[PDB]
Amino acid sequence: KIIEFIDPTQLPYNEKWEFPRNNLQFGKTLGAGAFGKVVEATAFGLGKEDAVLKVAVKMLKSTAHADEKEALMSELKIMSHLGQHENIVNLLGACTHGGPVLVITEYCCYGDLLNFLRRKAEAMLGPSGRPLELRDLLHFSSQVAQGMAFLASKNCIHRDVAARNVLLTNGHVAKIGDFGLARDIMNDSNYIVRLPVKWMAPESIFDCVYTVQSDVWSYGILLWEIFSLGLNPYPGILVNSKFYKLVKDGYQMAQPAFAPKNIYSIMQACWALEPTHRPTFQQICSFLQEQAQ
Numbered sequence: 001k002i003i004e005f006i007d008p009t010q011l012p013y014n015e016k017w018e019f020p021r022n023n024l025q026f027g028k029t030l031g032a033g034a035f036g037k038v039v040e041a042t043a044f045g046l047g048k049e050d051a052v053l054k055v056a057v058k059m060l061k062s063t064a065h066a067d068e069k070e071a072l073m074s075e076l077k078i079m080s081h082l083g084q085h086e087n088i089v090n091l092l093g094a095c096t097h098g099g100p101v102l103v104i105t106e107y108c109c110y111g112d113l114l115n116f117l118r119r120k121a122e123a124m125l126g127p128s129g130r131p132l133e134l135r136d137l138l139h140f141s142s143q144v145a146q147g148m149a150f151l152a153s154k155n156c157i158h159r160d161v162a163a164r165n166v167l168l169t170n171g172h173v174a175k176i177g178d179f180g181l182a183r184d185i186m187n188d189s190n191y192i193v194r195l196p197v198k199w200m201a202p203e204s205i206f207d208c209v210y211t212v213q214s215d216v217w218s219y220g221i222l223l224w225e226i227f228s229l230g231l232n233p234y235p236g237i238l239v240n241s242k243f244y245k246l247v248k249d250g251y252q253m254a255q256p257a258f259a260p261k262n263i264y265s266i267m268q269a270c271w272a273l274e275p276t277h278r279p280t281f282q283q284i285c286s287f288l289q290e291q292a293q
């Protein structure tokens with residue numbers, strides 16, 4: 001979403017991004033949903049620098065039709081309007097003319113943050129590369145906050161902030177984005193009939209209201225994901241009538257194993273029942289950037 005709400009089909013696709021599709025050489029498939037997939041590829045002569053580099057290319061699986069074609073184009077038009085930041089999955093180019101709609105973006109080698117933390121935790125238990133510590137977890141949260149702070153500054157709402165959507169690139173730089181149609185089949189469970197119920201705020205569940213403050217609620221759950229080393233939110237609890245009453249009546253998860261008091265306290269602030277009383281993304285940055293340094 002973009003507040004002004006703006007119809008994404010009405011937004012102009014900028015031809016500056018256009019890239020010759022024959023200058024793309026595809027490799028291994030990184031991910032694939034129901035009607036989308038993300039294959040890695042080498043882009044020859046990209047931008048003013050004409051840099052030969054490896055890029056992630058998202059595209060529709062052949063079994064995807066009119067609604068998907070406009071859906072993917074809507075994501076391209078949003079990424080073009082947003083601009084560029086260190087902590088967001090940046091648009092590098094796209095291919096609209098003479099074939100299917102392709103969307104070229106930065107390539108983050110370590111993958112998504114949820115799978116990263118789960119693999120790294122198992123690596124640290126191995127003994128009984130380079131082990132994770134508290135400063136790393138505080139760093140990731142600090143970067144994801146900066147990206148969301150940049151998104152909010154352009155009057156843009158994410159509607160699905162999560163560790164699955166956060167990508168880690170070279171030198172451990174967390175970039176927030178949205179896989180979208182190139183979802184993981186392993187992540188189909190979290191989307192209840194489809195929306196990510198466990199990450200959404202109450203107003204988004206009941207009133208269907210989506211604001212910058214509702215993304216902060218999700219960022220609170222994203223912190224719980226990070227400082228629990230990739231546990232599922234509300235672990236063991238099933239999504240049903242009983243869950244909705246708990247979330248509305250003000251139920252909160254217990255302090256995760258690796259969360260400092262001040263870090264867990266910030267999650268509770270993000271889980272304020274009143275949307276307006278939650279922390280701004282700018283407030284979360286200045287704090288976490290300090291706790292990092």
Ligand SMILES: COc1ccc(COc2cnc(COc3nc(-c4cnn(C)c4)cnc3N)cc2OC)cc1
Nearest residue numbers: 030031038056058089105106107108111165177178179
């Ligand atoms: C909120 O406004 C926005 C902002 C950014 C976006 C970008 O949307 C995306 C596009 N494309 C990808 C996928 O590309 C990549 N995939 C991998 C990958 C996957 N598995 N493995 C092993 C590696 C790594 N790096 C990649 N760049 C991921 C997006 O969001 C995360 C959409 C909406």
